[PDB]
Enzyme design. Structure first.
Site, mmCIF file in Angstrom:
data_model
loop_
_atom_site.group_PDB
_atom_site.id
_atom_site.type_symbol
_atom_site.label_atom_id
_atom_site.label_comp_id
_atom_site.label_asym_id
_atom_site.label_seq_id
_atom_site.Cartn_x
_atom_site.Cartn_y
_atom_site.Cartn_z
ATOM 1 N N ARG B 206 -25.205 -0.385 -21.672
ATOM 2 C CA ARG B 206 -24.803 0.611 -20.680
ATOM 3 C C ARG B 206 -23.791 0.042 -19.702
ATOM 4 N NH1 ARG B 206 -30.205 1.348 -20.997
ATOM 5 N NH2 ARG B 206 -30.912 3.220 -22.114
ATOM 6 N N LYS B 229 -31.540 0.454 -16.215
ATOM 7 C CA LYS B 229 -32.113 1.779 -16.344
ATOM 8 C C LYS B 229 -33.583 1.768 -16.707
ATOM 9 C CE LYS B 229 -31.310 6.470 -18.213
ATOM 10 N NZ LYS B 229 -30.367 7.316 -19.036
ATOM 11 N N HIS B 302 -19.296 5.940 -21.782
ATOM 12 C CA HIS B 302 -20.633 5.841 -22.321
ATOM 13 C C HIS B 302 -20.641 6.145 -23.807
ATOM 14 C CE1 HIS B 302 -24.973 5.550 -21.728
ATOM 15 N NE2 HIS B 302 -25.083 6.513 -22.626
ATOM 16 N N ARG B 305 -20.956 3.309 -26.507
ATOM 17 C CA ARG B 305 -22.268 2.814 -26.908
ATOM 18 C C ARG B 305 -22.766 3.524 -28.153
ATOM 19 N NH1 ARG B 305 -27.620 1.082 -24.538
ATOM 20 N NH2 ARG B 305 -29.123 2.789 -24.807
ATOM 21 N N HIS B 327 -34.379 0.390 -27.322
ATOM 22 C CA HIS B 327 -35.177 1.586 -27.477
ATOM 23 C C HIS B 327 -36.550 1.221 -27.983
ATOM 24 C CE1 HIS B 327 -31.507 4.431 -28.018
ATOM 25 N NE2 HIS B 327 -32.007 4.549 -26.802
ATOM 26 N N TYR B 336 -29.177 8.262 -30.413
ATOM 27 C CA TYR B 336 -27.892 7.556 -30.343
ATOM 28 C C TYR B 336 -27.308 7.468 -31.741
ATOM 29 C CZ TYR B 336 -27.883 6.265 -25.350
ATOM 30 O OH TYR B 336 -27.852 6.346 -24.067
#
Lengths: 349, 350, 349, 350
Positions: B206, B229, B302, B305, B327, B336
DNA sequence: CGTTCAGCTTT
DNA sequence: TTTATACTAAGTTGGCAT
DNA sequence: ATGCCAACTTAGTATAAAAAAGCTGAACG
DNA sequence: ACAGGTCACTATCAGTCAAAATACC
DNA sequence: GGTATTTTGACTGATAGTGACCTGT
DNA sequence: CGTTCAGCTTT
DNA sequence: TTTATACTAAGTTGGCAT
DNA sequence: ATGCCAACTTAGTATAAAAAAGCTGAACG
DNA sequence: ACAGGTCACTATCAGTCAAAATACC
DNA sequence: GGTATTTTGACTGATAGTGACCTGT
């Protein structure tokens, strides 16, 4: 006697007055006050003529603020127009609304009864249109939910209704049956047979089939973006259905010479076909085949399932699932469904 | 004031026509000339409304702990959120939604605030296409109301009956070709932009975390990242290499330490740490400068990513992509990994 | 003046009387009827002394039919006794109820406010007992749901409450830390070290550990039926934790000679151990180790996670999951959680 | 009747003590001697109850389409179910639950039937340990009420607020050793019992389907079964063999045609088809005769199918077991595969 | 070049 | 043991109009 | 032959709150 | 000539607020 | 002395009757 | 031996 | 992108009593 | 040494209606 | 001697039902 | 003729006032 007693109104031994609904035959007590008794009875007998209510002030007040069914449905159409739904989807909804308009009165939302709704729906069920019933119910329920979220009603008088049964009548299609039809389609325009082959070998929906352009084939792969789902796949021209002896490539060649147009499938005048038409002629060749089926006959769309099932056994579950474009397994395991035709031979694997 | 048996809410006209007047709407209702009947129904209607007229000041001890106003409440609700123990950014997101509520609704007594009113506001946002906002504002409104119910300032949550607006992500994805093209436009931009772009793709992190990687976070061939995050803690092997874009994590880092020179891996010309907003902003500059066109909203930094994830998914493994991104289960990944309509599924005969 | 006006009651220019709540300072209108005004004011000033209500007949009637909190809780205990729950489970519930008894008055269910409940719960949250709060809330909510299903209330005044945060404070245990403790446990009774080894190598819960009998080992497999879940497994005596250099078999032998009893783990007097005790001494050896941790220290139970994590890397996810007895993956992927201790080294696999 | 301004529900005592009498309970309430105050509150209480006293026979046109009785309704509800188009057996299950309701609740007006009453009945069943029944009765009660709501005979479903009783299956499983043991006790029983037991284990079919297999259902090494319960259509290869019990499907069938001789594969001594109840019953005889002991309820003939599944799961494959049983997705299987606490999970070092 | 505030959309 | 749910978007096929 | 409307039956795809970011036009030095 | 009801407009509601009056440590 | 709590009355945004006054017939 | 009715528990 | 939910059943560790 | 109560924090396991069977004590021929 | 309220018991409620009276094809 | 729908009044399970009558103080 010696009475002005209006009809329907009787006096008892003590001087107790009662009305008698003549529709039920059950009586109602009024009191000893003959003046009031008669009075009320008069007003009650006038309601027997026509149903015009000396409606209370209470109800009057609740009503003249709140919103009407058809009026809400006009508004409702505007809500959908804003959901970002596809045109066909909107067309369907409009239809269900149209039905709702025919089925229900234009009265205060709050005053449409579960009973009334129920009545309509059964009306569809008794004509054997169970499907339509389910959809109508749905639409109405959603219209209500919306009436709720804009604060016109407070509860969903439909959430209480008999959500119809969902029996699926259309019969599946067996490879043999395919062949017999394929043959019967001799006296049918050339594009039918081709359509049919292309269909089984690609497993795409008729809508999408009829929109395939020659410019969608690049380097041995047929590019397809499915109209109904937006899924995007590339199909290798090298496919073959050994069971029916169909070659995608070979079939693509016949289409190129015999049909020739911008669209892979074309009319005798080299023009694109409406998916309905294709469906129609298939039906025709089907009747001409003279095969017998339980319940409803197979339709053109059933070539998809046949494709999947055929590629299931020849290649693999996964291939079939990919070729059809199902992100979900719920759907794939549903095209794997035989619907009473075939016996699942148990292998020792 | 009178010479009348007339109960409240019922007025008599010059001809002797009696009408009830709803006090809520102020519009009156026709009854007829039969005063006996008129009053009769008026009483019945008065019972439905203002049942009685009296309130033992005892009833004061009841409705007291009740009366408060939306804004006076939002004021209190704020302080509540302040004690909730949430990250600065979150609180900021919340305060904003409150503000929207403050500008969207009257400062009336909570009890009097209608579902109809709320929806009206909420629809205001949807119709301007700000559906996303509508959802969040709705969400927060609902939370405030709950809290008021807790303090018994209300009995019912009128937000609940309202629905959440569903909204499809608009923002488009970034293809390798496009990346290359943007990178090329980057030439006018600072040196760090490119390096950032490369690093972003190779490390799949990120932007917020990127901007905070320090050279000290590298040890024995490993780049340590504690994600801001989520708190996920990962070590990235400085040996990765994106094949489709010809990027080398070692090489890219190398360029970084020689050219950029600062305590952080990415750094400002002024040799100081960069804000995540700026990295994004400059990328956006490039994107425009590249002249590419997209469906829906344009790709942003973003999106590097997702490109990262997608490329690695192929080059290495789905399994890998997940781990790189950070994740936990097997669920957030399947997001994603998604390309949202940018790619054709090449069917293999397998 | 020239008035009997009682306190708190003022008269305005027109002769309009108002009460003034002295707690809020906001006034209240009474009318022009001084007789009624005073009257009501008197009754209001008497309520200021003590709170005894000239409670309306309405409320009186609703109340003397309906049911009381503590009374409902007595009944509630009977409902649980009938759910077929395990003794410990019941013990926990009893406790939460006990807390509820201390926290809430014994008044009509219908009259316990969300506010009141809230207040209690925050009371627990402010003492830092967030956990207890969550559980209490839960219990109360379920007691209410039941009050609902037997038709005493009609809505769940708790469903409206702030279901507390769930932060888990207990720190995980690293292999190294294990070793250091293992060493510190020198001056501790012999069974501790053994307990500790047996624990990590089997991954069983302390409860179950302390109940393992020599008669549960048949033909090289340790039979375990887990008390908390009823899961039944057979563990091969042949396990080994290479990372800690523990052999199950070797460890089982030491237990046989040094400890000797019917139970695999035993006291110095050859008698079975209470799981608490084992937990206790571990704690002790932990303090004696003098290691530092963020937040709450690891406990004996953490050897389970260490076991799982250790067998994860040495053997396999599946093994670890089987050895622990998790039918669900949600749990297994939770013991796989490092909780801020260790960095997940990304391999190119 | 009077000489009093006394409003209804308020009576005066010989001393001049006024009390209100709740008409619902019939128990009275003390007010005091202040008639002014007494009546005042009585009026307020009368408004909460019997708001008014009048009903324009117009209100007759309202409450009319409303008044019906639980049993008079159950009577109607039956006929409804009769048009539902459900299998005979199902309807029977339903009719039974209705009957329970008929014996459990008064024939009062629907509107007056309390959640409290319903629960009371429902708890009656739970306390006798008939939880299973409680669930189903509850379930059906709820359905009847719905239907009455549809016909606007009621407004609210009082069943809904009540909860469904959760109940753990009691019935124990059947181990291979136990099967053998039961088979041995079978010797006093008819010849078909054994054959049935074997066939049941080897084919994994429901007793109902077993009893209806005819010799004509066998073709080219395949036994065709269209399952009566679900409509699943399968063909079983007559070559199966359970290793742990030494059963041969060919051999077992063979014994069948020579010994049993009848149109169905299993058959009565009288050479006629057998009822599924009887097969079960006789098995139950054997089980007792075998003297085995179990935890919870004893295994029944349907448990032969679980044994079947479990053995095949090991000998062949999970995948196989599923197909044999006739289970569509990947879910209903994970049930027959379960042994409910009869087996120790031998941990392999894999 | 590069920062913080705001109002929106995305993880 | 099987299904439900809430939307969305087709496909199916009878007709009337070219 | 065919093309387009209309009433019906069938495919397809999936949670919702919390929490925390990321995007980008302005105004500003 | 009228059913049916909208509409501005006072006189009072119903109550807030900030000094004056007065009680409490 | 010094703060807190009643009285008190000037001052103010609401309400509910009112008769004048629109309007479709 | 073997059937149908009923009231319960399981797929 | 992360979590929630509704029960159930432990484990943790301070004390007072042997 | 230790054993057992008590207030707290942590593990563990998962849907609910429809539909359709299967089980088994009785009474019966 | 009394707050507070239960309890049997009539006179009427409120209405059902099956013949008598009477209207409709 | 033949069926259907009002009247009508005998007959019946409920209710709500009633004064006598329990009871904790």
């Amino acid at each position: 006697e010696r009475r002005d007693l209006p009809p329907n109104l009787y006096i008892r031994n003590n001087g107790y007055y009662c009305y008698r609904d003549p529709r039920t035959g059950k009586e109602f007590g009024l009191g000893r006050d003959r003046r009031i008794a008669i009075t009320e009875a008069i007003q009650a007998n006038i309601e027997l003529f026509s149903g015009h209510k000396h409606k209370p002030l209470t109800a009057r007040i609740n009503s003249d603020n709140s919103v009407t069914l058809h009026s809400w449905l006009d508004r409702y159409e505007k809500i959908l127009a804003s959901r970002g739904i596809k045109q066909k989807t909107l067309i369907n909804y409009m239809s269900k609304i149209k039905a709702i308009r025919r089925g229900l009165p234009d009265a205060p939302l709050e005053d449409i009864t579960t009973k009334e709704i129920a009545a309509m729906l059964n009306g569809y069920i008794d004509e054997g249109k169970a499907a339509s019933a389910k959809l109508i119910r749905s639409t109405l329920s959603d219209a209500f939910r919306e009436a709720i979220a804009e604060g016109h009603i407070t509860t969903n008088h439909v959430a209480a209704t008999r959500a119809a049964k969902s029996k699926v009548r259309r019969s599946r299609l067996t490879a043999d049956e395919y062949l017999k039809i394929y043959q019967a389609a001799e006296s049918s325009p050339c594009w039918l047979r081709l359509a049919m082959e292309l269909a089984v070998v690609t497993g795409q929906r008729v809508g999408d089939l009829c929109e395939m352009k020659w410019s969608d084939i690049v380097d041995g792969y047929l590019y397809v973006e499915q109209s109904k789902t937006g899924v995007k796949i590339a199909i290798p021209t090298a496919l073959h259905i050994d069971a029916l002896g169909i070659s995608m490539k070979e079939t693509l060649d016949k289409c190129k010479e015999i049909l020739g147009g911008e669209t892979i499938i074309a009319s005798t005048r080299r023009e694109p076909l409406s998916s309905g038409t294709v469906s129609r002629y298939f039906m025709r060749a089907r009747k001409a085949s003279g095969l017998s089926f339980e319940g409803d006959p197979p339709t053109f769309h059933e070539l998809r399932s046949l494709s999947a099932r055929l590629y299931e056994k020849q290649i693999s579950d996964k291939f079939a699932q990919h070729l059809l474009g199902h992100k979900s397994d719920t759907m794939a395991s549903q095209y794997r469904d035989d619907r009473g035709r075939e016996w699942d031979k148990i292998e020792i694997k």
